[PDB]
Copies of this chain bind each other. A is one copy, B any other.
């Protein structure tokens, strides 16, 4: 995965929408309750230089809010979630004002599990951001892709 050079994490703060998503395995995104079917509501960079995600996930028949802390690492644009550092967030690219591309990656199995998203600042379709997402995906072993309409962007859990 080619990660963003010169990321300024403080500039990604505030509201985002999940416009599109893709994963290595159909099972990660197939169902509305699938393990990687999460929607980014907000990014909150911390004083420590960590990244807080506010997520919505469909769980047990409702839209559940979760705050996930991705801690800074010695590799820029790469953040660790778990104590083993096997669950990471990889920031691929952003222009801070319109779009952000990132992946969750799990390195616990011999086969990499990956789910990547195209985030936008406003609940609208941006073809530019979707083309940058598709280009970033070309080198990745993706088997499922989803994209949402503006109606879905403003709905709880899309």
Contact = CB atoms under 8 A, between A and B. Distances in A.
Contacts of A11: none
Given A31-B30, A32-B30, A146 B147 contact: no
Interface in A58-93: none
A108 interface: no
A145 interface: yes
B31 A146 contact: no
Nearest to A149: B143
Interface residues of A, number: 11
A144 B143 contact: no
Contacts of A26: 146, 148
The interface residues of chain A, by DSSP majority, are classed as loop
Contacts of A30: 30-32
Nearest to A141: B149
Interface string A21-37: 00000100011100000
A154 to B, nearest CB: 16
A67 to B, nearest CB: 26
Interface string A118-152: 00000000000000000000000001111111000
10 contacts: A26-B146, A30-B30, A30-B31, A30-B32, A31-B31, A143-B146, A143-B147, A143-B149, A144-B144, A144-B146
Given A26-B148, A30-B31, A143-B149, 9 more contacts: A26-B146, A30-B30, A30-B32, A143-B146, A143-B148, A144-B144, A144-B145, A144-B146, A144-B147
